[PDB]
Amino acid sequence: DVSLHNFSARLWEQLVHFHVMRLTDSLFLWVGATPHLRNLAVAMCSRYDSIPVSTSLLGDTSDTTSTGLAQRLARKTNKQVFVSYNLQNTDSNFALLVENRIKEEMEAFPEKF
Amino acid sequence: AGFDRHITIFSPEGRLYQVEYAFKAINQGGLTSVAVRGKDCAVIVTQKKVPDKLLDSSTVTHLFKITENIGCVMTGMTADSRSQVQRARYEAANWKYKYGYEIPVDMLCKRIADISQVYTQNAEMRPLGCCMILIGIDEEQGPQVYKCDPAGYYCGFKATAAGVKQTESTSFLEKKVKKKWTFEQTVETAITCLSTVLSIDFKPSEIEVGVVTVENPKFRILTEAEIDAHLVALA
Amino acid sequence: MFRNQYDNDVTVWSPQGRIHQIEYAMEAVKQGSATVGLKSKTHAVLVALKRAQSELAAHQKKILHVDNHIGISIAGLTADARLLCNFMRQECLDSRFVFDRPLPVSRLVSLIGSKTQIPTQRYGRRPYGVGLLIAGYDDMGPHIFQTCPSANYFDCRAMSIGARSQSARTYLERHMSEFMECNLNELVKHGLRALRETLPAEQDLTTKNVSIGIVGKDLEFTIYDDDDVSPFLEGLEER
Amino acid sequence: MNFSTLRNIQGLFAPLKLQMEFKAVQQVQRLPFLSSSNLSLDVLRGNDETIG
Amino acid sequence: GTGYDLSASTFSPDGRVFQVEYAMKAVENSSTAIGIRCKDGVVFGVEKLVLSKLYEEGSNKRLFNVDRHVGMAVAGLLADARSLADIAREEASNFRSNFGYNIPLKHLADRVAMYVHAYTLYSAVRPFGCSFMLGSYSVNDGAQLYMIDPSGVSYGYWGCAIGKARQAAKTEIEKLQMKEMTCRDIVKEVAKIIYIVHDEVKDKAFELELSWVGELTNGRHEIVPKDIREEAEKYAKESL
Amino acid sequence: GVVYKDGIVLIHFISPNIYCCMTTQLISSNLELHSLSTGRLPRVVTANRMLKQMLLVLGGVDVTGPHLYS
Amino acid sequence: YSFSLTTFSPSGKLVQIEYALAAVAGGAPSVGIKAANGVVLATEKKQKSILYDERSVHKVEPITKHIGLVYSGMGPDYRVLVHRARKLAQQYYLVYQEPIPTAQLVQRVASVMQEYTQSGGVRPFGVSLLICGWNEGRPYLFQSDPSGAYFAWKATAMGKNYVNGKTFLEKRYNEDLELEDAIHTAILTLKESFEGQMTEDNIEVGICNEAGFRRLTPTEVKDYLAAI
Amino acid sequence: PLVISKQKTEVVCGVPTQVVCTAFSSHILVVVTQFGKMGTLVSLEPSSVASDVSKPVLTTKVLLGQDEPLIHVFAKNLVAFVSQEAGNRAVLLAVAVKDKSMEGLKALREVIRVCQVW
Amino acid sequence: TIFSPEGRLYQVEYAMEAIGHAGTCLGILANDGVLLAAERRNIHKLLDEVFFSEKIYKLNEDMACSVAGITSDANVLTNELRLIAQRYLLQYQEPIPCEQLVTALCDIKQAYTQFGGKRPFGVSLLYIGWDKHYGFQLYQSDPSGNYGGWKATCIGNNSAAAVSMLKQDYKEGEMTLKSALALAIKVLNKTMKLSAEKVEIATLTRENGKTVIRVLKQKEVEQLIKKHEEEEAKAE
């Protein structure tokens, strides 16, 4: 079937919400502070490359957060992962906090990912 | 490139020449309007010109009904004036929907001026070359006359004029107001001012008159018979 | 001399009352090879010419299939031709899939013109640079239509577009009085003879540079190429 | 009172004019820059005197 | 207006917009068309030039049918005229759907004029380059005739002319007494005027297009029958 | 909750001569802005409409006379 | 005597800001004086004709219970800035449940003004503002330029002939000045170079105290003018 | 939850199908799959040059999958009403259906309507 | 936002040239403290002894800065610095390092020279502060986004002569607060007749495990300039 999970955390001075949809060997993840969707990417594990094959579907091509996060998640889980990262913070270490929170939720509830 | 080809560029003396050119565009019509406020009435009188004999004269007008109790007269470009009238009607409807009561004349004039101000600070759009004069009656203040301009400046008046011969009309009205009005005297004063300024003897089919009164607070447009009766009384 | 300031954008009027970018775009149709279209009382025929280069380097699709009763020929920009073909295919497929009835050719051409008029008025856009010949059959009979980059369309008895198509147009005008009573064979012969007028005095039609598309009553749109054009080519006389 | 009502009462031109004005004013927009105040946008939208 | 004529959002030092003036000048390189309002109807007339003999008869029409009761005659760019005709059809259909009765010609003219004027304020678009007239008839409203120009101004007329030779056509129309005539004479007068204001040397051979809407048609816009057209053309030729 | 003569006798504060029995702060601020812009005392109908779009007894006196809503 | 198409002037300043300041310097005079207890604001409201209605528009406007301001320059820009200032004050009161300090409001308005000096397709505001307030039993007086640079003053003037007004204020200012004497001095500074007859209808006066900010009724202005 | 979603499964034309709808402030996400996976990804947006801006025309673009006219026709006829009833908002559709027919589309439209979140 | 055919940024060059006409600022690092010295170009008797173009801003209790450029841009940048410092303090329960703060501001400054269609900030900075990682520090910044640490530097008008004199008369590891103040006064007098009312002096030091930032008074400046005059008279 299809399962839905939702959680949130407070980082710096903002509240960040995470939405997860689980399918048959698939994953869709949305991260943002406001209900907007302007970025999207997909990554898959392939035997013709050492880095998982990925491409950008929506949004600006100068932002690489969604692509890299999808690639790392696909490498870790061996699934097809869609990632929509919509946070708009200029600090480069905020994404590290977001990734750490995502990881923590992953070992917290392994059955929902 | 240039201080006068850009709406969003100041001149070395601190001037915006596009707004001045928009002001100059008002005189392209070639007509004059006069508004005079009385003790318990307001009168607007404009000049009508129908030169072509193949043109239906019933379709030429410059007096508009914004609301059941608000009138208007426009001077300048015809299409710009009609667009401005439509925008004013939309704003009045929106205000009524949002606040539950009819918009006042000063509030409508302020909203129009606020809209007009934005056109002067952005480079992708141009100001409208027209001037708006509104009349009405307030619940606790009486008759009111207001006027707009392309620059976004508005004020209340006891008597005002627009278009060509505006300076002469203001000079004529200043002496009368200083010297120091019934319903018949206001219309007579406005018609006399227009006639003396234009140096033309008027006919009942050459002018348009719109009035508002405390007794009957609804905007009304006078008919040719009534205008002729007023002209006979004046003469 | 004075045209420099007014011939760079499509949203700028010239002081003479002209837009030069539309004319420049219309000039791009003559960069492709020639095409000929003609119709009879019961049939509509499209005849096209292929580029003189070798066939090894590239295969050219000059005549395309849109529906069971509509086919087109192109001359101009390949990307614009592809876009217009996709639009027409989607329109016809939607009509059939929804209402279970074919789409009229006049309606399709009107939709094409309405779609192509838009980019001639907006800033930062350019007109389409392709020309089309449309042949179809419906309740009203055969039809031949011509489309222009200026978003104009015409109803024709016979027309030719492309590079050096004036001679073909002259031949079609001269011999247009006998197309109605002709059958399929004579119609294709007339089309081939008209197309041959755009070649030098020594060249001749060959199976490797001729494409034919035929639609008509009790016959769906069909494209003949390579050895399929031999029956039509046989019987032609010397120039 | 919305775009459909305006179209039904006045015509197709009024919502088109409103949207063109909105798009022309909204040209001051960029992601990697600092926070901005939309003064002209609030003036045109009519919400320059109310708090959401 | 050099230096102030590259955009529609710029004012001239004397208070003029030159892009709109160029758009209105763009109408003068098109064949002339006239329209005369009569006692019981309106009659249209277009001088149509032939481009080639390869075109089917009845193509490139310049007299449209906006609705069941509205006729339209255009001049200028053809694509702009077709888009404006589509806009007018959409407006008429919407009014019919909402209010339940046929739209008066005044409201339709106002809506189309405002739509045209909306394109003369911004630098992201360009003004339309066409002019057109609308005609209608009703038992309780009589005959109506209107004009819309690229600037966006609409007026009611008794006799109108647009195109390359509008001045001579207007001078010829001014000599008529259309307020007391009938359609059967107005058609011949229109044909005579069109034949008079045509240039034989500068322009090649042409064909005459005529239409009316009026009482004898019961509020419908149609094409003149062939016999009446032939009689009117013969009268015009013998008068000229 | 009785409409007396030339007034209403009836308590959150939302505006001068307008009382109702937090969104009330927002409505009060909006009414203050409206009064500053117009230059006149606010009307009861405006408060009623603002509360209606916000989502209880409302009573006040304006130029039109005593009012009472529910 | 010089027109420049560049961004920075040869003196090291923005050219458009200099042009906006030149536009400001051609406006009506304004005067602000800070006394021992309170601040007084005054301006010239001369009208072109008797046909005008003075009770229609005002140049001295209140922002909140304890803040008011006056301008010198273009009217529409002042009108569009006043609404934003009021909205910012209301937002601060809603969020922090306390009246906004004068310095914070000046900072926010200056930031809004500065925002328009960097973007493309817009032009800077052509106004200069004088802001007065009262916080913790201590009066304040600020002045802001079109570019958004603000300083705190004790007595200043802008508009026409502002250098002579500044000289007059420097010559006739005292550290222990009272509110009544401050009002008299402001009216005298306005009267200096008035080219006309001053009445109670062609000038505007506003004062700030510990009780708040308010605009003087013309009867009070006439009473004050009677003393002079 | 900042985003509201609904899901519900049935059997349409003899084959099981799952429908999930999720609402954003700029997009509506509709998933209609018969394999349990996201297949073709389609984006529908209102046109920016529409003359009737109250009821604009929709532009269809394929982001991932096979590009055919049938895909465009199916997507438009399937989510036009979803786009219209949401206030002229864009729709992101992920569809994986074995066979396409008008009866199946009409059957699936009711299931989509049942899971309304807009 | 456009590369020159020789590989240069004209907007950045114009901004730096414009800054080259601003006021003169000084910074000297000593063994027990660090100081800033600026020039007061404009002055009036009617200013309110607060917000009087005080060129030495206070970011935190540990840091301070000076500006040579556009006042409004300086205000924006200083406000952003204050929010950045407060946010880092709230996140990590620890004061932000000076180099980290400078890098955070320089990233914002650099983004404007690469993205969008906005002009870069025409402001140069001078940071002084203390932290447990490195102690007393002194940095500099320019519109292009470059930064670096120094021991004595000057920005503004006639900065080349000030730098030359500083490098001629500066000795590492042998100078204290008094010698630094005397050298700063001498350099400012040479690069500017100087009056005690035309300068502003601020100092930073540690007092029993607590950073103290002070601004020198008019009397102290007069005493210092009188001592300098006495020394220069004794020299001749």
Side-chain angles (χ1 to χ4, degrees), chain B residues 34-37 43 133 145 147 156-161 169-170 173-174 177 181 189, chain G residues 49-53:
Chain B
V34 166
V36 177
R37 169 179 80 158
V43 175
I133 302 181
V145 181
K147 179 189 182 179
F157 298 86
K158 308 183 178 177
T160 175
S169 294
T170 47
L173 282 166
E174 277 179 8
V177 165
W181 272 348
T189 305
Chain G
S49 288
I50 195 181
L51 303 180
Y52 285 74
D53 197 34

PDB file of all heavy atoms in Angstrom, chain B residues 34-37 43 133 145 147 156-161 169-170 173-174 177 181 189, chain G residues 49-53:
ATOM      1  N   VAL B  34     -15.714  73.214 -15.634  1.00  0.00           N
ATOM      2  CA  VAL B  34     -15.809  74.098 -14.476  1.00  0.00           C
ATOM      3  C   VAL B  34     -16.730  73.456 -13.449  1.00  0.00           C
ATOM      4  O   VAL B  34     -17.822  72.991 -13.791  1.00  0.00           O
ATOM      5  CB  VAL B  34     -16.325  75.497 -14.866  1.00  0.00           C
ATOM      6  CG1 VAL B  34     -16.749  76.277 -13.635  1.00  0.00           C
ATOM      7  CG2 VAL B  34     -15.261  76.260 -15.636  1.00  0.00           C
ATOM      8  N   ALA B  35     -16.292  73.427 -12.190  1.00  0.00           N
ATOM      9  CA  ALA B  35     -17.092  72.916 -11.086  1.00  0.00           C
ATOM     10  C   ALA B  35     -17.187  73.984 -10.006  1.00  0.00           C
ATOM     11  O   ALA B  35     -16.169  74.557  -9.608  1.00  0.00           O
ATOM     12  CB  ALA B  35     -16.492  71.630 -10.510  1.00  0.00           C
ATOM     13  N   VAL B  36     -18.405  74.250  -9.538  1.00  0.00           N
ATOM     14  CA  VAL B  36     -18.662  75.272  -8.530  1.00  0.00           C
ATOM     15  C   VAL B  36     -19.517  74.663  -7.428  1.00  0.00           C
ATOM     16  O   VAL B  36     -20.510  73.986  -7.712  1.00  0.00           O
ATOM     17  CB  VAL B  36     -19.359  76.509  -9.132  1.00  0.00           C
ATOM     18  CG1 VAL B  36     -19.682  77.520  -8.047  1.00  0.00           C
ATOM     19  CG2 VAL B  36     -18.489  77.140 -10.206  1.00  0.00           C
ATOM     20  N   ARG B  37     -19.134  74.905  -6.178  1.00  0.00           N
ATOM     21  CA  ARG B  37     -19.861  74.403  -5.020  1.00  0.00           C
ATOM     22  C   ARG B  37     -20.693  75.523  -4.414  1.00  0.00           C
ATOM     23  O   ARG B  37     -20.200  76.640  -4.227  1.00  0.00           O
ATOM     24  CB  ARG B  37     -18.897  73.838  -3.975  1.00  0.00           C
ATOM     25  CG  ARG B  37     -19.544  73.530  -2.639  1.00  0.00           C
ATOM     26  CD  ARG B  37     -18.541  72.956  -1.656  1.00  0.00           C
ATOM     27  NE  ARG B  37     -17.721  73.993  -1.042  1.00  0.00           N
ATOM     28  CZ  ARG B  37     -17.082  73.856   0.112  1.00  0.00           C
ATOM     29  NH1 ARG B  37     -17.150  72.736   0.811  1.00  0.00           N
ATOM     30  NH2 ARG B  37     -16.357  74.870   0.575  1.00  0.00           N
ATOM     31  N   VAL B  43     -22.378  71.879  -8.773  1.00  0.00           N
ATOM     32  CA  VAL B  43     -22.681  71.967 -10.197  1.00  0.00           C
ATOM     33  C   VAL B  43     -21.400  71.750 -10.989  1.00  0.00           C
ATOM     34  O   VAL B  43     -20.365  72.349 -10.680  1.00  0.00           O
ATOM     35  CB  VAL B  43     -23.315  73.324 -10.559  1.00  0.00           C
ATOM     36  CG1 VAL B  43     -23.511  73.440 -12.060  1.00  0.00           C
ATOM     37  CG2 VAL B  43     -24.636  73.505  -9.832  1.00  0.00           C
ATOM     38  N   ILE B 133     -12.735  65.093 -11.806  1.00  0.00           N
ATOM     39  CA  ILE B 133     -13.384  65.953 -10.820  1.00  0.00           C
ATOM     40  C   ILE B 133     -14.641  65.243 -10.340  1.00  0.00           C
ATOM     41  O   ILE B 133     -15.511  64.898 -11.149  1.00  0.00           O
ATOM     42  CB  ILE B 133     -13.723  67.337 -11.394  1.00  0.00           C
ATOM     43  CG1 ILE B 133     -12.463  68.031 -11.910  1.00  0.00           C
ATOM     44  CG2 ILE B 133     -14.409  68.190 -10.343  1.00  0.00           C
ATOM     45  CD1 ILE B 133     -12.715  69.409 -12.477  1.00  0.00           C
ATOM     46  N   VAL B 145     -16.392  69.020  -3.467  1.00  0.00           N
ATOM     47  CA  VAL B 145     -15.771  69.026  -4.787  1.00  0.00           C
ATOM     48  C   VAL B 145     -14.323  68.586  -4.632  1.00  0.00           C
ATOM     49  O   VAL B 145     -13.585  69.145  -3.813  1.00  0.00           O
ATOM     50  CB  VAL B 145     -15.846  70.414  -5.451  1.00  0.00           C
ATOM     51  CG1 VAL B 145     -15.224  70.376  -6.834  1.00  0.00           C
ATOM     52  CG2 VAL B 145     -17.284  70.893  -5.526  1.00  0.00           C
ATOM     53  N   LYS B 147     -10.670  66.895  -6.840  1.00  0.00           N
ATOM     54  CA  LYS B 147      -9.988  66.896  -8.126  1.00  0.00           C
ATOM     55  C   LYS B 147      -8.705  66.082  -8.028  1.00  0.00           C
ATOM     56  O   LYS B 147      -8.025  66.107  -6.999  1.00  0.00           O
ATOM     57  CB  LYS B 147      -9.685  68.330  -8.576  1.00  0.00           C
ATOM     58  CG  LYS B 147      -8.962  68.449  -9.902  1.00  0.00           C
ATOM     59  CD  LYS B 147      -8.518  69.881 -10.142  1.00  0.00           C
ATOM     60  CE  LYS B 147      -7.840  70.036 -11.489  1.00  0.00           C
ATOM     61  NZ  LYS B 147      -7.425  71.442 -11.730  1.00  0.00           N
ATOM     62  N   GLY B 156      -9.403  69.259  -1.936  1.00  0.00           N
ATOM     63  CA  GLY B 156     -10.770  69.740  -1.991  1.00  0.00           C
ATOM     64  C   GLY B 156     -10.815  71.221  -2.319  1.00  0.00           C
ATOM     65  O   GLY B 156      -9.934  71.984  -1.932  1.00  0.00           O
ATOM     66  N   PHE B 157     -11.860  71.624  -3.037  1.00  0.00           N
ATOM     67  CA  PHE B 157     -11.978  72.984  -3.538  1.00  0.00           C
ATOM     68  C   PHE B 157     -13.374  73.529  -3.276  1.00  0.00           C
ATOM     69  O   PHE B 157     -14.320  72.781  -3.018  1.00  0.00           O
ATOM     70  CB  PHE B 157     -11.685  73.062  -5.043  1.00  0.00           C
ATOM     71  CG  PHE B 157     -10.294  72.640  -5.419  1.00  0.00           C
ATOM     72  CD1 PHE B 157      -9.998  71.309  -5.649  1.00  0.00           C
ATOM     73  CD2 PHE B 157      -9.287  73.577  -5.552  1.00  0.00           C
ATOM     74  CE1 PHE B 157      -8.722  70.919  -5.998  1.00  0.00           C
ATOM     75  CE2 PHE B 157      -8.010  73.194  -5.901  1.00  0.00           C
ATOM     76  CZ  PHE B 157      -7.728  71.862  -6.124  1.00  0.00           C
ATOM     77  N   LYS B 158     -13.485  74.854  -3.340  1.00  0.00           N
ATOM     78  CA  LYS B 158     -14.780  75.517  -3.423  1.00  0.00           C
ATOM     79  C   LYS B 158     -15.197  75.759  -4.865  1.00  0.00           C
ATOM     80  O   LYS B 158     -16.396  75.783  -5.164  1.00  0.00           O
ATOM     81  CB  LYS B 158     -14.747  76.849  -2.671  1.00  0.00           C
ATOM     82  CG  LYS B 158     -14.225  76.752  -1.251  1.00  0.00           C
ATOM     83  CD  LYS B 158     -14.281  78.098  -0.551  1.00  0.00           C
ATOM     84  CE  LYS B 158     -13.800  77.992   0.886  1.00  0.00           C
ATOM     85  NZ  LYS B 158     -13.774  79.318   1.561  1.00  0.00           N
ATOM     86  N   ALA B 159     -14.226  75.940  -5.755  1.00  0.00           N
ATOM     87  CA  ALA B 159     -14.455  76.061  -7.186  1.00  0.00           C
ATOM     88  C   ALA B 159     -13.148  75.726  -7.887  1.00  0.00           C
ATOM     89  O   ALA B 159     -12.072  76.054  -7.382  1.00  0.00           O
ATOM     90  CB  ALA B 159     -14.932  77.466  -7.568  1.00  0.00           C
ATOM     91  N   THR B 160     -13.243  75.073  -9.041  1.00  0.00           N
ATOM     92  CA  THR B 160     -12.051  74.633  -9.751  1.00  0.00           C
ATOM     93  C   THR B 160     -12.362  74.507 -11.235  1.00  0.00           C
ATOM     94  O   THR B 160     -13.516  74.591 -11.662  1.00  0.00           O
ATOM     95  CB  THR B 160     -11.522  73.307  -9.194  1.00  0.00           C
ATOM     96  OG1 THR B 160     -10.422  72.855  -9.993  1.00  0.00           O
ATOM     97  CG2 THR B 160     -12.612  72.252  -9.202  1.00  0.00           C
ATOM     98  N   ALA B 161     -11.307  74.305 -12.020  1.00  0.00           N
ATOM     99  CA  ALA B 161     -11.429  74.166 -13.462  1.00  0.00           C
ATOM    100  C   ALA B 161     -10.310  73.269 -13.968  1.00  0.00           C
ATOM    101  O   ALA B 161      -9.299  73.064 -13.291  1.00  0.00           O
ATOM    102  CB  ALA B 161     -11.388  75.526 -14.166  1.00  0.00           C
ATOM    103  N   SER B 169     -10.096  80.696 -16.033  1.00  0.00           N
ATOM    104  CA  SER B 169     -11.264  80.318 -15.243  1.00  0.00           C
ATOM    105  C   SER B 169     -11.009  80.511 -13.753  1.00  0.00           C
ATOM    106  O   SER B 169     -11.879  81.010 -13.027  1.00  0.00           O
ATOM    107  CB  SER B 169     -11.649  78.870 -15.541  1.00  0.00           C
ATOM    108  OG  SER B 169     -12.102  78.730 -16.876  1.00  0.00           O
ATOM    109  N   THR B 170      -9.825  80.122 -13.277  1.00  0.00           N
ATOM    110  CA  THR B 170      -9.498  80.310 -11.866  1.00  0.00           C
ATOM    111  C   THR B 170      -9.429  81.790 -11.509  1.00  0.00           C
ATOM    112  O   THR B 170      -9.894  82.200 -10.439  1.00  0.00           O
ATOM    113  CB  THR B 170      -8.179  79.617 -11.530  1.00  0.00           C
ATOM    114  OG1 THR B 170      -7.198  79.943 -12.522  1.00  0.00           O
ATOM    115  CG2 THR B 170      -8.366  78.108 -11.488  1.00  0.00           C
ATOM    116  N   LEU B 173     -12.955  83.003 -11.197  1.00  0.00           N
ATOM    117  CA  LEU B 173     -13.669  82.484 -10.034  1.00  0.00           C
ATOM    118  C   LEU B 173     -13.148  83.072  -8.730  1.00  0.00           C
ATOM    119  O   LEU B 173     -13.902  83.170  -7.753  1.00  0.00           O
ATOM    120  CB  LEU B 173     -13.574  80.959  -9.998  1.00  0.00           C
ATOM    121  CG  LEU B 173     -14.489  80.191 -10.953  1.00  0.00           C
ATOM    122  CD1 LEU B 173     -14.059  78.738 -11.053  1.00  0.00           C
ATOM    123  CD2 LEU B 173     -15.936  80.295 -10.506  1.00  0.00           C
ATOM    124  N   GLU B 174     -11.867  83.451  -8.687  1.00  0.00           N
ATOM    125  CA  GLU B 174     -11.286  83.976  -7.455  1.00  0.00           C
ATOM    126  C   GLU B 174     -11.997  85.247  -7.006  1.00  0.00           C
ATOM    127  O   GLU B 174     -12.336  85.400  -5.826  1.00  0.00           O
ATOM    128  CB  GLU B 174      -9.794  84.243  -7.654  1.00  0.00           C
ATOM    129  CG  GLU B 174      -8.908  83.023  -7.492  1.00  0.00           C
ATOM    130  CD  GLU B 174      -7.446  83.334  -7.735  1.00  0.00           C
ATOM    131  OE1 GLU B 174      -7.110  84.528  -7.887  1.00  0.00           O
ATOM    132  OE2 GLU B 174      -6.631  82.390  -7.776  1.00  0.00           O
ATOM    133  N   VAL B 177     -15.564  84.463  -5.712  1.00  0.00           N
ATOM    134  CA  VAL B 177     -15.554  83.799  -4.412  1.00  0.00           C
ATOM    135  C   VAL B 177     -15.163  84.778  -3.312  1.00  0.00           C
ATOM    136  O   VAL B 177     -15.752  84.775  -2.223  1.00  0.00           O
ATOM    137  CB  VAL B 177     -14.624  82.573  -4.447  1.00  0.00           C
ATOM    138  CG1 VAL B 177     -14.322  82.088  -3.039  1.00  0.00           C
ATOM    139  CG2 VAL B 177     -15.258  81.462  -5.266  1.00  0.00           C
ATOM    140  N   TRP B 181     -24.999  81.405  -1.722  1.00  0.00           N
ATOM    141  CA  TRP B 181     -25.313  81.075  -3.106  1.00  0.00           C
ATOM    142  C   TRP B 181     -26.424  80.036  -3.189  1.00  0.00           C
ATOM    143  O   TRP B 181     -26.302  78.940  -2.646  1.00  0.00           O
ATOM    144  CB  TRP B 181     -24.067  80.568  -3.832  1.00  0.00           C
ATOM    145  CG  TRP B 181     -23.250  81.654  -4.453  1.00  0.00           C
ATOM    146  CD1 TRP B 181     -23.617  82.956  -4.627  1.00  0.00           C
ATOM    147  CD2 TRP B 181     -21.926  81.535  -4.986  1.00  0.00           C
ATOM    148  NE1 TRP B 181     -22.602  83.655  -5.235  1.00  0.00           N
ATOM    149  CE2 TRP B 181     -21.553  82.805  -5.465  1.00  0.00           C
ATOM    150  CE3 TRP B 181     -21.021  80.477  -5.104  1.00  0.00           C
ATOM    151  CZ2 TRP B 181     -20.315  83.047  -6.053  1.00  0.00           C
ATOM    152  CZ3 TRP B 181     -19.792  80.719  -5.688  1.00  0.00           C
ATOM    153  CH2 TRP B 181     -19.450  81.993  -6.155  1.00  0.00           C
ATOM    154  N   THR B 189     -23.568  81.198 -12.126  1.00  0.00           N
ATOM    155  CA  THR B 189     -22.161  81.562 -11.980  1.00  0.00           C
ATOM    156  C   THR B 189     -21.272  80.681 -12.848  1.00  0.00           C
ATOM    157  O   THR B 189     -20.370  81.176 -13.533  1.00  0.00           O
ATOM    158  CB  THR B 189     -21.743  81.463 -10.512  1.00  0.00           C
ATOM    159  OG1 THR B 189     -22.622  82.260  -9.708  1.00  0.00           O
ATOM    160  CG2 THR B 189     -20.316  81.949 -10.330  1.00  0.00           C
TER     161      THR B 189
ATOM    162  N   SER G  49      -4.352  79.733  -3.927  1.00  0.00           N
ATOM    163  CA  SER G  49      -5.541  80.548  -4.130  1.00  0.00           C
ATOM    164  C   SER G  49      -6.489  80.357  -2.955  1.00  0.00           C
ATOM    165  O   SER G  49      -6.336  79.439  -2.146  1.00  0.00           O
ATOM    166  CB  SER G  49      -6.235  80.199  -5.450  1.00  0.00           C
ATOM    167  OG  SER G  49      -5.487  80.662  -6.560  1.00  0.00           O
ATOM    168  N   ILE G  50      -7.478  81.250  -2.876  1.00  0.00           N
ATOM    169  CA  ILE G  50      -8.519  81.139  -1.862  1.00  0.00           C
ATOM    170  C   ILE G  50      -9.506  80.029  -2.200  1.00  0.00           C
ATOM    171  O   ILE G  50     -10.281  79.603  -1.336  1.00  0.00           O
ATOM    172  CB  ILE G  50      -9.236  82.494  -1.699  1.00  0.00           C
ATOM    173  CG1 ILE G  50     -10.073  82.522  -0.418  1.00  0.00           C
ATOM    174  CG2 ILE G  50     -10.103  82.789  -2.913  1.00  0.00           C
ATOM    175  CD1 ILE G  50     -10.827  83.815  -0.211  1.00  0.00           C
ATOM    176  N   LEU G  51      -9.489  79.534  -3.442  1.00  0.00           N
ATOM    177  CA  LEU G  51     -10.412  78.482  -3.850  1.00  0.00           C
ATOM    178  C   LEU G  51     -10.146  77.161  -3.140  1.00  0.00           C
ATOM    179  O   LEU G  51     -11.023  76.293  -3.128  1.00  0.00           O
ATOM    180  CB  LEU G  51     -10.333  78.275  -5.362  1.00  0.00           C
ATOM    181  CG  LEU G  51     -10.614  79.497  -6.238  1.00  0.00           C
ATOM    182  CD1 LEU G  51     -10.509  79.137  -7.710  1.00  0.00           C
ATOM    183  CD2 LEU G  51     -11.978  80.075  -5.922  1.00  0.00           C
ATOM    184  N   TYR G  52      -8.966  76.992  -2.552  1.00  0.00           N
ATOM    185  CA  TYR G  52      -8.623  75.738  -1.901  1.00  0.00           C
ATOM    186  C   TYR G  52      -9.385  75.581  -0.588  1.00  0.00           C
ATOM    187  O   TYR G  52      -9.916  76.539  -0.023  1.00  0.00           O
ATOM    188  CB  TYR G  52      -7.118  75.661  -1.645  1.00  0.00           C
ATOM    189  CG  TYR G  52      -6.298  75.377  -2.883  1.00  0.00           C
ATOM    190  CD1 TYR G  52      -6.099  76.357  -3.846  1.00  0.00           C
ATOM    191  CD2 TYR G  52      -5.724  74.131  -3.088  1.00  0.00           C
ATOM    192  CE1 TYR G  52      -5.351  76.103  -4.978  1.00  0.00           C
ATOM    193  CE2 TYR G  52      -4.974  73.868  -4.217  1.00  0.00           C
ATOM    194  CZ  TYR G  52      -4.791  74.856  -5.159  1.00  0.00           C
ATOM    195  OH  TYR G  52      -4.046  74.599  -6.285  1.00  0.00           O
ATOM    196  N   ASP G  53      -9.433  74.342  -0.108  1.00  0.00           N
ATOM    197  CA  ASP G  53     -10.079  73.996   1.155  1.00  0.00           C
ATOM    198  C   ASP G  53      -9.008  73.459   2.093  1.00  0.00           C
ATOM    199  O   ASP G  53      -8.542  72.326   1.927  1.00  0.00           O
ATOM    200  CB  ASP G  53     -11.192  72.974   0.937  1.00  0.00           C
ATOM    201  CG  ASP G  53     -12.152  72.898   2.104  1.00  0.00           C
ATOM    202  OD1 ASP G  53     -12.402  73.944   2.737  1.00  0.00           O
ATOM    203  OD2 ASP G  53     -12.656  71.793   2.387  1.00  0.00           O
TER     204      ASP G  53
END
